[PDB]
Write a protein that binds this ligand. Structure first.
Ligand SMILES: Nc1ncnc2c1ncn2[C@@H]1O[C@H](COP(=O)(O)OP(=O)(O)O)[C@@H](O)[C@H]1O
Ligand SMILES: Nc1ncnc2c1ncn2[C@@H]1O[C@H](COP(=O)(O)OP(=O)(O)O)[C@@H](O)[C@H]1O
Ligand SMILES: [Mg+2]
Ligand SMILES: [Mg+2]
Ligand SMILES: [Zn+2]
Ligand SMILES: [Zn+2]
Ligand SMILES: [Zn+2]
Ligand SMILES: [Zn+2]
Ligand SMILES: [Zn+2]
Ligand SMILES: [Zn+2]
Lengths: 590, 396, 186, 590
RNA sequence: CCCAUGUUAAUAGCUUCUUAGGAGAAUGACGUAGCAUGCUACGC
RNA sequence: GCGUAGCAUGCUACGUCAUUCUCCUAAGAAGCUA
């Protein structure tokens, strides 16, 4: 087929078959891409290989057109000619092709490995059509890296609520959470097919897993769970729409007598109503999801699609929407696979509803009035382009916080990524400044929020709350078990249980730690509700049990530290094992 | 598998002598593709054999009509020519004879197809052709039966049906004769063996099938183009009742087609030096050509003038753009020159003078639009009668 | 051909030949220069006809590549059109009654001819004259396929709406028959 | 691409290349046109340029035809023959062509720049196909003169309805009114894109250019404005459809007991029935635009299209039809763009009603049974050609007076155009006399008729009124300020403001001034409805406040003055500038 | 020193004609190599 | 007499250019027949 070259936007029919994505390149650009890197195979409407019954020379420089086909230098017909010549590669639209000298940057994108953080920062400063390409090939590379994971199958049939794993020998083990699912396959004699998705969590002790089946046809031992890497569709729409300020608000008809609670941001509601897309930088727990609720109320005769990256963000937003917005004109869309049970108090899958809450991956093709995308630091440019492709609306509002943890970003191991390169929106917030800023927190007490203000902001955090004398940071050396792919501090849980007897406050508490293995084992010896820092960042609670396992760069992340300390409202039993990580906060020594 | 298929009914826009609308069943490409692959080898070996009964693919030009008419008269004893006419051939034709036609066109697959493969191809023909869903102006109706005129095998399935009705007429005419009155002791024994092979055997008797087919070719020679048949039957036999006359076809079409074939559409030509009275809408006359006598086909003059005067597109009215249209019409109307009625023989010279006038005014206008006549111009031969008479001489 | 060195060799051999004609060398040398000019012209002929054949073939391959690209683009467009047609005809089903009759079959197969007759919501009756109209759908409700239908519209052959007060024995001449009465399942 | 020669209607294929309209030309006529003037470029089915690889010879006297292309003198193949030879440029249909002698007029029409006085008198006494060609090339010249205006650029945005503009250096400023629409741009790096169709008006205080816009975009500093130019549609229909005196009335059925008001007009109605097109000429306010409604009420089965070149003329017709005609079977047509507001009481944009009303440029292609073209003095041969191309009808009635003010003819600066050159119909009324004539002032008081029947119409008017004692005309010099080109006179607005507190009944009067800008600027001091003299032609008012702004050739034009003062139904105040004209009328002194 | 305007067309057969590509042949012509013989310049 | 060189003429091979023919295919316009 024919299309448009990525780095010059000229009509072509050539595409480097050595890239994982096969991007369209014109004559000159493809010539420059094959002459430079190790990319050699080129696909036209037919592939550029030696099309003799016996040969395999799959480069383009060595290849000669003869008759109606292509041959190597050993089998070529006496009549000419090489494709890769005249400064070009023989393809379509040769006279009207106009190249560009970006092929060094394009080669650097196509040659990278996503191990350095230099690849990620180069994959964010390029032009828009290369930003899409980098996001697409990065998603593909991470999906290939996920695919090569060791299989599991049940030992034998045990129970409805507790099975037991058996892995392939000596392979990497997937992180066990609600993000990761398996599929059971049925190759029994007889037609390998999916028996259903399985969601796995760690159980009480040993090699035990609490399991959730999607299709409940109970399995035997021959049906096996695999990580099932799934297809990634291409993307077309830009990461952001082009901005266009308006003199006055178009089509958004404001109402009167809104409320006195969120009347303090009607100026920022209007400033949203003016421009095309808006950027709200909310400090941790400053009414950011509250802002979008008040926005939906200020222009209530409009249509809003709330969109979130992770399920937890739209879960918190659905709770707040039930609280303030009228439930009757509001639908929460759940994907049909039903892998994770969403917050269902709205009508499920009413896409024509006035206000629709959804994850970014399962968005229906709709036109809206203003679409509010939520928690942008979780999202990568793939997500922003997906929401721009599926959802067309008169206004776009991106709310989030650079001071949170980014996308999980598994491929990156050497170097650490600044928030500036998390995605395009977080680049733009850090570049010109955010459109809107919220300024008075309502979760932390004053001392802890002042610790936040001195840490990552320019002394701009304050909170309308006073301390409960229940902000702890224990002194334990933190013996790490490490009998697992992650790190576990079960003696830190021993420290927690040998304390907290004289402090009975945090007994409905949520357990927080940067290591999900400690979260997994924590819910077993004691009946504690636990959720890691990944399942944090959207979940606000009053009583908190935090543990810091090691003293290293994993626990030294300042954004993860900020989002960890900003979680607790009235009572925090926290263990900080690092002296420096106890030195920068004013907490009780005991 | 069985693929049922919707077939449109298109209204035809062409010149005709009677004012009933004519419709053609446009069959889906999902049916035409597969039926082409199934039947194309046989259907392109029928059109490439000269001298057989089924004269499809034998041209009437270059002395082809003479050769068709000479292979009809393949030594029948006292010939009379006979021609019949199925009324509503494509609508009254029962489902059983269409299934027989598709089972005779599929006997060539003894090796390439299995048995269940041939059954599912029969079911696909009966679901896409015979009793399909006809779409007639934005509405799906059920077509009850009978051939649809647009599938991949329609002139040939029609030819098989036509041969079947002629053989059934001969079987009825031979059995229905008395039997003590049959003087020729060979033919009376043939009637006896024929009844026995019909109603007293369950296995096909290839000796007698060959012998009866030899009888039919010796005394009932046929020539078939999809339903136009010319028969050259022995006349002493058909007078004695041992071979089908017209009245046997009237009876057969009564009980096996549910139509009454009125004898004002079936001709009988007792004098062979006038040829068939009408076959494929061309009459036939015996002219002197070169040094010997040949048969030539001539059309109906009203047809050729009606194709001149009434055209089905506005741009065909212009004339000067369409000189190939009048060359083709004069090629078709050439043998009218040898017809003895003078007002018939003027149709050819009308077309020649019209081609000459058309070309004179064409070069007039193409000399006005420029100021140079065409340098090379070989239209000077389309108004000489030798270019047309070369189309009916047997050299090529 | 012109950018080939063969043209340069032929041109300089021709220049040497003109210079020797103007120079009047010995006849053996003139024959030698004619020989060299002839072999230069033969090499020029070989290479120039070679490049002409080559560029004809390359333009042919470009034209067939264009044809393949057009065929594959049109295949993509037809596949899109067929898929959207199938999905609109999916959305047009009447899934309650259709599920009822399909789940009432003992094998799961029902003949196609009774899919509309028991699940269609609109009945279009086409009526050629007035006696037929009086017998099949007189009044604003009637019966067909063991249901009761309510007449929602009557148009004529001209797609003009005809009121039910029009269709009488004396106003039957002035109506453009046939009449298409559209009814709904009650 | 064959066509018809303009000046002999032979068949041909050439087109002159230097003429703006590319008129088709026969061979002999094209030789006459390219051998006398400097128009040396000719286009056949392909141009007559030299088809060398690189050569610029276009002069048809130089080229040769060889092979299948036209080569200059230094690239001709030896099989060639000259084009511009034997007195005939070679084109198609070469030898079936008739020469002409009008190539001493067609040259002057196609060559001149339309600025002198004589070119319009030559564009109006030629043959009919030359009248159409001359009108077409005049329209094209007036369109391409608009490219000579300056280019705007924003300096700052004082307010959302108050821009600030700086114009290009050395190029004249366009006049700022709603005739001239501009297009915006933001062309920096970054979006060389139109950002809306705007139009301007000079705000009263400061150098503020109050802009109206189609869009709702915020305007930056760098946004810059380019005037739009409309392509001239080619025209085909004759200016005057040929007359055919019938024997008896066809297509029209007269009426029983029409009215007591139009009873004296019956003879002219029979005359309109008998002819094909008829022309009516009367001095102002004497029943001309009334006669058209009487034609409506005398042939009630006759579908009528009323047309004029302004919008206030057709609005005066609309008001008269509202008073007399049934309002259900009437209409009115407004264009979609519509920078000006029109009359809105009929069912707007319903051309199927029996009595349609339109401006001549915005007519829809339809038929009629009698079509009434009011105000032919404001019509050019382009307008009459358009009304003859769209409207097909049985009778035409052209109503108007030559002594009112014409189409403006912006290019005309050197000379004066007598009435008999305004278009073809005004020539017909000043050559052979009008078919129907009614002079008796039924609108203006006898003082107005007494002073206006001495200026233009030499003592031929008597009024069906008397001296109504409300005709005041004063002489105040009025020290002027200058706008772009349309001067503004503050102290005369001052004396009018004095004549508004001291005469209470006159607060319904309409302001009339010869300049558009003062007409806009005296609304913000006074508040009266405002109308310019050029667009006031045909609609009357109860009281009229006229203010002569400047002593020039434009505002001291006696036709402009006549159409200014003959619109007052009962009372008028005239603040004069010229001494002699103030002595020419005979009002009260004031 | 300036004023009015944007309206549905089937399956199959045969035949005529035109254009383009390729192959082959036939003739002619040029050029190169190889051979047949003759002639001439040199050596033996 | 032989060898070498050149020249003539005739044949064979190859490279090209024109003319003609045949055919195969592709594409288009048209006519008739069932
Ligand atoms: N301007 C405000 N005035 C009063 N309360 C506020 C304001 N903004 C936010 N809140 C409080 O903060 C709570 C929302 O907290 P949470 O659910 O964590 O959302 P967010 O993370 O957006 O703050 C609400 O219950 C609300 O009472
Ligand atoms: N027959 C008549 N008798 C009395 N008054 C008339 C007659 N005809 C017209 N009028 C008055 O004279 C005025 C002329 O208006 P109009 O026809 O618009 O004049 P013009 O066409 O010159 O603008 C109208 O206001 C009308 O009231
Ligand atoms: Mg929030
Ligand atoms: Mg008037
Ligand atoms: Zn590549
Ligand atoms: Zn490119
Ligand atoms: Zn090879
Ligand atoms: Zn010119
Ligand atoms: Zn002329
Ligand atoms: Zn040149």
């Amino acid at each position: 087929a024919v299309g448009a070259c990525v780095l010059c936007n000229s009509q072509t029919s050539l595409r480097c078959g050595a890239c994982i994505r096969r991007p369209f390149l014109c004559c000159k650009c493809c010539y420059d891409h094959v002459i430079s890197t190790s990319h050699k195979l080129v696909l036209s409407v037919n592939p550029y290989v030696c099309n003799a019954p016996g040969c395999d020379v799959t480069d383009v420089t060595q290849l000669y057109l003869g008759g109606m086909s292509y041959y190597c230098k050993s089998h070529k017909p006496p009549i000419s000619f090489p494709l890769c010549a005249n400064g070009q590669v023989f393809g379509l639209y040769k006279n009207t092709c106009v190249g560009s000298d970006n092929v060094t940057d394009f080669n650097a994108i196509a040659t990278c490995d996503w191990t350095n953080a230099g690849d990620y920062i180069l994959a964010n400063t390029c032009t828009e059509r290369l930003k899409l390409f980098a996001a697409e090939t990065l998603k593909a590379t991470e999906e290939t890296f996920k695919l090569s994971y060791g299989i599991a199958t049940v030992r034998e049939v045990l129970s409805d609520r507790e099975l037991h794993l058996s892995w392939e020998v000596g392979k990497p083990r997937p992180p066990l959470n609600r993000n990761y699912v398996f599929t059971g396959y049925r190759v029994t004699k007889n037609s390998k097919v999916q028996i259903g998705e399985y969601t796995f969590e760690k159980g009480d002790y040993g090699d035990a897993v609490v399991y959730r089946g999607t299709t409940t046809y109970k399995l035997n031992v021959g049906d096996y769970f695999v990580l099932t890497s799934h297809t990634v569709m291409p993307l077309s729409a830009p990461t952001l729409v082009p901005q266009e300020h308006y003199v006055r608000i178009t089509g958004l008809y404001p109402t009167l007598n809104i409320s006195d609670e969120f009347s303090s941001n009607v100026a920022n509601y209007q400033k949203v109503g003016m421009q095309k897309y808006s950027t709200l930088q909310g400090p941790p727990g400053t009414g950011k999801s509250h802002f979008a609720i008040g926005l939906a109320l200020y222009y209530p005769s409009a249509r809003i699609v709330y969109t979130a990256c992770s399920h937890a963000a739209v879960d918190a937003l659905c709770e707040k929407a039930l609280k303030y917005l009228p439930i009757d004109k509001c639908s929460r869309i759940i994907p049909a696979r039903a892998r994770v049970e969403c917050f269902d108090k709205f009508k499920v899958n009413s896409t024509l509803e006035q206000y629709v809450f959804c994850t970014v991956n399962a968005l229906p093709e709709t036109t809206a009035d203003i679409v509010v995308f939520d928690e942008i630091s979780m999202a990568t440019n793939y997500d922003l382009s997906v929401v721009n492709a599926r959802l067309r609306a008169k206004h776009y509002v991106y709310i989030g916080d650079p001071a949170q943890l980014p996308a999980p970003r598994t491929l990156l191991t050497k170097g650490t990524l600044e928030p500036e390169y998390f995605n395009s929106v977080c680049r733009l917030m850090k570049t010109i400044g955010p459109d809107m800023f919220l300024g008075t927190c309502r979760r932390c007490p004053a001392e802890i929020v002042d610790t936040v203000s001195a840490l990552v902001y320019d002394n701009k955090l304050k909170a309308h709350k006073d301390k409960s004398a229940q902000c702890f940071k224990m002194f334990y050396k933190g013996v790490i078990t490490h009998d697992v792919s992650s790190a576990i501090n079960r003696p830190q849980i021993g420290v927690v249980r040998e304390f907290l007897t004289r402090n009975p406050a945090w007994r409905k508490a949520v357990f927080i730690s940067p290591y999900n293995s400690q979260n997994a084992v924590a819910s077993k010896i004691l009946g504690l509700p636990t959720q890691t820092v990944d399942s944090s960042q959207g979940s606000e609670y009053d009583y908190v049990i935090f543990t810091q396992t090691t003293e290293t760069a994993h626990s030294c992340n300042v954004n993860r530290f900020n989002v960890a300390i900003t979680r607790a409202k009235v009572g925090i039993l926290c263990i900080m094992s690092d002296r420096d990580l106890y030195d920068k906060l004013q907490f009780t020594s005991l | 598998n069985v693929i049922p298929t919707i077939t449109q009914m298109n209204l035809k826009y062409a010149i005709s002598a009677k004012n009933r609308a004519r419709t053609v069943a446009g069959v889906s490409i999902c049916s035409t593709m597969t039926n082409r692959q199934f039947h194309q080898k046989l259907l392109k070996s029928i059109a490439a054999t000269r001298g057989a009964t089924v004269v499809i693919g034998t041209s009437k030009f270059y002395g082809g009509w003479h050769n068709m008419l000479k292979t009809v008269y393949s030594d029948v004893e006292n010939p009379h020519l006979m021609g019949w006419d199925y009324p509503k051939c494509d609508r009254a034709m029962p489902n059983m004879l269409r299934i027989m036609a598709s089972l005779v066109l599929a006997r060539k697959h003894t090796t390439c197809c299995s048995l269940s493969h041939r059954f599912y191809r029969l079911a696909n023909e009966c679901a896409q052709v015979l009793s399909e869903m006809v779409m007639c102006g934005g509405s799906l109706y059920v077509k009850p039966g009978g051939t649809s005129s647009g599938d991949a095998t329609t002139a040939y399935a029609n030819s098989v049906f036509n041969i079947c009705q002629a053989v059934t007429a001969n079987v009825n005419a031979l059995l229905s004769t008395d039997g003590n009155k049959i003087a020729d002791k060979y033919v009376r024994n043939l009637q006896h063996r024929l009844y026995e092979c019909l109603y007293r055997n369950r296995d096909v008797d290839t000796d007698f099938v060959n012998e009866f087919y030899a009888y039919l070719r010796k005394h009932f020679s046929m020539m078939i183009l999809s339903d136009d048949a010319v028969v050259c039957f022995n006349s002493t036999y058909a007078s004695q009742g041992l071979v089908a006359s017209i009245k046997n076809f009237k009876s057969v079409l009564y009980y096996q087609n549910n139509v009454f074939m009125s004898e004002a559409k079936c001709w009988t030509e007792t004098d062979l030096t006038k040829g068939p009275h009408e076959f494929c809408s061309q009459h036939t006359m015996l002219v002197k050509q070169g040094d010997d006598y040949v048969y030539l086909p001539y059309p109906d003059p009203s047809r050729i003038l009606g194709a001149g005067c009434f055209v089905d597109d506005i741009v065909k009215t212009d004339g000067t753009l369409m000189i190939e249209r009048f060359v083709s019409l004069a090629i078709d109307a050439y043998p009218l020159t040898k017809h003895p009625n003078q007002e018939y023989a003027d149709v050819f010279h009308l077309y020649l003078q019209y081609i000459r006038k058309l070309h004179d005014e064409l070069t007039g206008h193409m000399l006005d639009m420029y100021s140079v006549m065409l340098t090379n111009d070989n239209t000077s031969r389309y108004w000489e009668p030798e270019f047309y008479e070369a189309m009916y001489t047997p050299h090529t | 051909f012109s950018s080939l060195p063969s043209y340069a060799a032929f041109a300089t051999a021709q220049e040497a030949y003109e210079q020797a004609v103007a120079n009047g060398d010995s006849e053996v040398v003139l024959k030698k220069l004619k020989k060299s000019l002839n072999v230069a012209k033969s090499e020029f002929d070989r290479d120039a006809a070679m490049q002409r054949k080559l560029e004809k073939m390359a333009d042919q391959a470009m034209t067939q590549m264009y044809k393949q690209a057009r065929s594959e683009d049109k295949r993509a467009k037809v596949t899109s059109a067929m898929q959207t047609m199938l999905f609109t005809m999916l959305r047009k089903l009447d899934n309650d009654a259709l599920n009822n009759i399909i789940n009432n079959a003992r094998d799961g197969c029902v003949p196609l001819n009774i899919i509309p007759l028991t699940t269609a919501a609109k009945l279009m009756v086409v009526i050629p004259d007035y006696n037929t109209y009086k017998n099949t759908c007189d009044g604003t409700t009637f019966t067909y396929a063991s249901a009761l239908w309510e007449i929602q519209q009557v148009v004529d052959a001209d797609s003009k709406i005809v009121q039910l007060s029009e269709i009488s024995m004396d106003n039957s001449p002035n109506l453009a028959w046939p009449l298409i009465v559209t009814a709904l399942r009650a």
